Design a protein around this ligand. Structure first.
Ligand SMILES: Cc1ncc(COP(=O)(O)O)c(/C=N/[C@H](C)P(=O)(O)O)c1O
Ligand SMILES: Cc1ncc(COP(=O)(O)O)c(/C=N/[C@H](C)P(=O)(O)O)c1O
Ligand SMILES: Cc1ncc(COP(=O)(O)O)c(/C=N/[C@H](C)P(=O)(O)O)c1O
Ligand SMILES: Cc1ncc(COP(=O)(O)O)c(/C=N/[C@H](C)P(=O)(O)O)c1O
Ligand SMILES: [K+]
Ligand SMILES: [K+]
Ligand SMILES: [K+]
Ligand SMILES: [K+]
Ligand code: NA
Ligand code: NA
Ligand code: NA
Ligand code: NA
Lengths: 431, 431, 431, 431
């Protein structure tokens, strides 16, 4: 049983609480698209763990590689190079767009955004950073200063020079021109304001191609390109945070490939490490050279460690080889259609959006009003878990609660169907 | 050979440089106290990789546990609990001093300091952080704002409210009272200044028990206690960063046990993960409860992941069971004596300091002047590597270069001797 | 002659340049609505000096009072009270709206905004300040941090927590809803953004009722009220900066009386001192009491000095007694009509706006496009001076250049006509 | 009577309190070294009003000049030049040391420090400012951020990059080397710390030659010079704030002349305006030229106003002509000797320091301990006023309360004696 008195006792006496609420179960095993509680009940993992496991849990290949380096080459002085590191850096230079040539191999997504941000400040000689008002880049210093969906209160000033602009949100547009949502004009209008507040020290704009924690908000047609132009125009770098969207999740190896827009620095983590703590940034040779000339420093314990690098290389291999980017589009499409079928069935489903296997479903009280359905979302989530489907809902003011659905890229056609079915049931039950 | 053209070619084309210089070799394997290059030459690892591997490389136990969880329970939604996590948190509550009750399991040392710092700001309702002028707490936002040994220039303002005070340094004292180094008066004098600059928002003082990157500077007799009193007096938390000193490295499980001073929050990482990316903070039940009441948030991808937690539990087990804390004192002592013998032999060795297996050797041009020996240190380091002994030297203005010697707690009596011998040779050669 | 070689020589060798360009003449005298150069040519002062002299130059009454206190009671220890000070404070409590009860008598407009801002931060326990993107509150620290029309570049970070929102500008609207300029929705939309960037420390919003330096932009119908509600809703004070609009300039004693909106703190200066350096802030008894309980400090050399206080009391007297507030409406109206007649004559006159004797005329290349007329404005200004009419034009990006026309409240019907006539001539000449 | 019910009623209902406590009397007139209450009692003004009136109250010459410009040329558009302005700027270029060539004519001491600070940041391209831990530069933004004797709490963060170092204080030294107060080593030691906290953006050090509000602390032999060298070494400007020490108060026209050290920018106000609100900064032609090339902006309402400029020129004239700088030394010396006689009489007088007519007397409980005499100082001050001698005491932690004695440079031999006599009586009464 999940009721192990001692377990929960120790849990209550000795864990720091760091957000949300702990799920009432005891996870004892995980395999493929499932985790299993202490009774052995299999729970369908519709969020790939914490939005990371693109290959599912305990993938045999990963298991092998892990084993292999744990026993042969694990951790090293940060000045010592090895093959897994150079291979990975090389692979990444190779599968990212042209213009992205050099990599730095770290441990977390926030760390990767801090590294990119420090690099941008260094090469521009400037310090103001601009993000989206619904962004999430991490819990550490600079990543947090640029995170606007949460975490800003009660902890003192953010970093000097932090600004945000509204993200382009087609489901709930607030900037109109000639009776239509002119998200490109909204962008211009936002920048002029920024321009006016700036001390003349704009260093970068940082952005998620699809804002996940912020409500699966996908940047619309042409937006990214226009954004890149705003930056170039101001001598600012554009850093694209692809912690969740990278590595195939949205049905392209990297989301920025979809818009055909190449950022100055690209950050990776969640899906790169597929569960393990490996992250990275990739930038141009020119930017890297200038950073280096300026003494760029970002020296950590695990930067360039062989085992994690070895792991991420295996991740890319598998993804490539098993055409998991394409599986994302097919299963993605399979899942979207189901969701839309549900939506056909239940009025509370106000919107189905996202791309590939990063989909969101927005719960509303009224389609005409798009009135958020207060607690209905939480209910559905509770029912899902009872039904054996692990889900996650995010909620910001002005928005219905949004389910973030992101199964492993290794997910089966059956698993999807199972998932869709458990979900309609949870919805039927929640009403 | 280490000369693999392609290797270095790819290395040059695709790695971001992040500090220092890459060692000219290709590391292909590692085992116990050694790593091996591409020719198969065994290099004696006198810094435990990046000051982490207390159990040495590829420890069989770690190898087993790793394997075991990689295949059974790897990574989870951050709201899902499991045994390795609760066990570890519990173990830590148990082996740390009384008053430290709840843990938060993260990935890196900087991340662990950011978590502690955010917690302190939250519970005090304040934001000013004070560290040592020769500190190193990491490369991310807040950890970096509190890092004074390096990284401050070229990257814009640090965090609002960052201050430093001089660390107590008995080898190069600068605060005199009645013909003697009154480091306690220096402390008082520093705080009064701080007090005068403060906006009345002092939240914490953060400190390494022994400043490593800063030159192996050990806080002297009674200092820590007095420091803790300064904080209490100001309603500030005291955060002790034991990334390197924790887990037995200095010959006590935790360095703060040595002074018998319990900090408000304790941070762990390098030695906790013993090579893998696992970090943690531990605080009191009261502080944790208040943080929680105030909405403490620090939600990451890998917080509470089973595999890493599983790994750190095995680390503690081994350390405990093999009495590696005591091995640190014995080997530590064996090594100190050797160093002192060298010092007897070579005038350039100006000081031998540190504790347990975290020792430093300061190179000088003149013992009377304590004039730094310009390049001599770098030379010795170069000779060591030729001689097959991997070493590391740190250098700050006003100080001779310092070797940071920190072999695995699993190091043999022979390995030490080997090390001492290779070192005297390198010194003989460098002169 | 204005060509005094020595004068200009010394001028060139010994004056720091602090913005704009020095006018090529030597002012030797001033009287009523004119100043006179070294040839004795009378220049019609259409900006009341630096937008201050509501009573015109060298007003006999002011001259008397000045004389009187210079010789009897001039300057005092800031802890010594006297009649002119208590009378003035009292007068102000009396002529400002209900709810504004206590005054602090200072020297400059920036100083008065710094005092109001410090007070707001103190009583809210918070520090973030929000202003308009085209504001001007002064050159000192906090006043400057809240000034967005200029001065932000090249001088390092502004104050922590500085934000701006776009001002409501009916002549060049950029926020549309249902085919119309919905400036109230623009306001809401701006605040939500602010809300999202805030660290939860909003202390005040500071605002000019009519943005002068920013282009004579008058807050439209209902805007102020809605603004006040935004603040109340967030527990923020509303500080109204009436440096130029106060004391009758816009045809009400205070502009905020026009909207019937009472701010938490009101600041005064330019027109209060009518040329002399006297400024003030006025707040509620409750706010003042709380500030005092919290140790409010703003102790300066000239706070509470008798002579300046004596001067401002005489200013209010005269204004009251000579019904100069009403003269502002009549002459104001006389002047607006003329301007509009011009506008009837010249296509370049794109807009005539403002209120009372604070009017603006926007120069454009095209009424349909509202294309700014590049240099045309500067030309007209140059011609005016030749014609003996001192004028001033302000120019921000996205806007035609704007003449700021603000003659003394003591201005004659003839002086206005003269002014209108000189202006059409300058325009005819400039084309 | 001073008991005018109505006066105090209005006083209580309508004055904002801004520090300290209001003196219980009603000042109705002032003349020479005295002010007179409502009963007509003459109070001997031992602080020259708020440390400003070097010529005493209502000086006939000032009265004439004031009158003259009030009626002929008062206030102007900030782009219009006139004689009083160019003459004054010229005079100042002329009486300040070589290397100080161009002036900017403002209104307050804080404003003058903000102007100097903005200029320094602009020309260095940097933003960190360093002051003394017991400084007072004003209540506005940057001046306040650099003020450490008071005002820092309850009002949010100071300006980014604010630092302080301890001032050299020979009466209460805390930095010892070889049994002696090595204030030069203290300076070095302070800077190294600063260096370590800096983001590499040191723009200026700002300093009072004698810290007044901070306790009449006179920089000792050679200190200033060494300070200037610290700045030059770091590419920082040195700004000397001579608001109180300038214009003859310390027995040289400017205190920096005494050490023969020329700062990059010199600020003036209190004594320059001698009671009226006039302030100024003076810098080198080179610095000014570079500021201008960089768009230096500091455009205010009263910058370059004729009347105030006219007043300060008359002040300098009188000072020069009446050899008031020398009167300061003679009367200063007369007063110091008296003070020392008192000190001979009363043990509570722990120290008599300062220079010229800017003297301080530190009250202690014990000369051996230098134990502050708690409330004794306040008592003496209360007795002085009863005795008809207006005085002022300042008190910081770690220090006895200090009387700041600074009579008009126009003070008579008799007035001094009167003052000394009233003071010994107050002391006799207070015990
Ligand atoms: C005391 C301490 N705390 C925190 C960190 C941050 O660790 P991480 O960068 O992995 O987040 C370090 C890093 N150290 C260097 C990397 P070195 O080993 O050279 O002293 C540290 O020494
Ligand atoms: C886009 C993005 N970048 C960076 C990070 C920081 O990752 P980390 O905290 O591991 O350093 C996250 C974290 N996400 C949440 C944890 P969620 O998965 O709930 O959206 C992210 O979503
Ligand atoms: C050295 C110095 N610089 C600048 C200022 C700011 O002057 P202001 O506030 O008029 O702008 C002061 C004020 N002083 C007090 C008011 P005190 O006279 O009590 O020492 C000062 O002492
Ligand atoms: C609305 C407002 N508030 C405060 C100030 C600051 O006044 P000061 O600089 O005298 O302290 C100004 C200055 N204005 C310019 C000088 P302009 O007259 O050109 O609009 C102002 O317009
Ligand atoms: K490493
Ligand atoms: K997790
Ligand atoms: K005063
Ligand atoms: K002026
Ligand atoms: Na690429
Ligand atoms: Na414990
Ligand atoms: Na009122
Ligand atoms: Na000079």
């Amino acid at each position: 049983l999940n009721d192990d008195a001692t377990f929960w006792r120790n849990a209550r006496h000795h864990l720091v609480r760091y957000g949300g609420t702990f799920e009432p179960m005891i996870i004892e095993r995980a395999k493929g698209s499932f985790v299993y509680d202490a009774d052995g009940r299999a729970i369908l993992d519709f969020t790939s763990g914490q939005m990371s496991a693109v290959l599912g849990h305990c993938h045999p290949e990963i298991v092998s590689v892990i084993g292999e380096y744990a026993g042969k080459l694990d951790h090293l002085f940060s000045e010592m190079l090895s093959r897994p590191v150079v291979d990975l850096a090389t692979r990444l230079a190779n599968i990212t767009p042209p213009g992205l040539d050099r990599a730095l191999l770290l441990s977390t997504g926030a760390e990767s955004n801090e590294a990119a941000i420090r690099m941008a400040k260094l090469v521009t000689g400037k310090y103001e950073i601009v993000g989206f008002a619904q962004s999430w880049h991490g819990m550490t210093g600079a990543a947090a200063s640029a995170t606007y969906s949460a975490g800003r209160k009660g902890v003192g000033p953010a970093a000097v020079g932090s600004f945000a602009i509204p993200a382009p949100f087609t489901y709930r547009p607030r900037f109109e021109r000639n009776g239509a949502y002119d998200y490109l004009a909204e962008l211009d209008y936002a920048f002029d304001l920024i321009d006016r507040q700036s001390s003349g020290n704009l260093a970068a704009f940082i952005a998620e191609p699809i804002l996940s924690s912020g409500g699966i908000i996908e940047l619309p047609d042409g937006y990214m390109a226009a954004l890149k132009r705003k930056c170039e125009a101001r001598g600012m770098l554009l850093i694209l945070d692809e912690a969740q969207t990278g590595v195939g999740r949205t049905g392209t190896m990297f989301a920025c490939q979809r818009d055909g827009v190449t950022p100055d620095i690209l950050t990776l983590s969640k899906t790169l490490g597929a569960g393990l703590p490996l992250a990275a940034i990739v930038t141009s040779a020119a930017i890297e050279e200038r950073a280096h000339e300026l003494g760029y420093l970002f020296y950590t314990t695990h930067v360039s460690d062989p085992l994690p690098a070895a792991v991420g290389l295996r991740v890319l291999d598998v993804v490539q080889r098993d055409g998991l980017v394409a599986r994302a589009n097919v299963m993605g499409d399979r899942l979207r259609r189901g969701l839309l079928d549900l939506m056909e069935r239940f009025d509370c489903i106000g919107d189905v959006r996202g791309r590939g296997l990063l989909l969101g479903v927005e719960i509303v009280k009224d389609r005409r009003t798009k009135e958020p359905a207060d607690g209905l979302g939480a209910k559905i989530t509770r029912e899902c878990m009872n039904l054996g489907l692990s889900m996650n809902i995010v909620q910001l003011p002005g928005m219905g609660g949004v389910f973030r659905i992101a199964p492993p890229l290794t997910v089966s056609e059956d698993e999807i169907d199972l998932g869709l079915s458990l979900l309609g049931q949870a919805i039927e039950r929640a009403l």
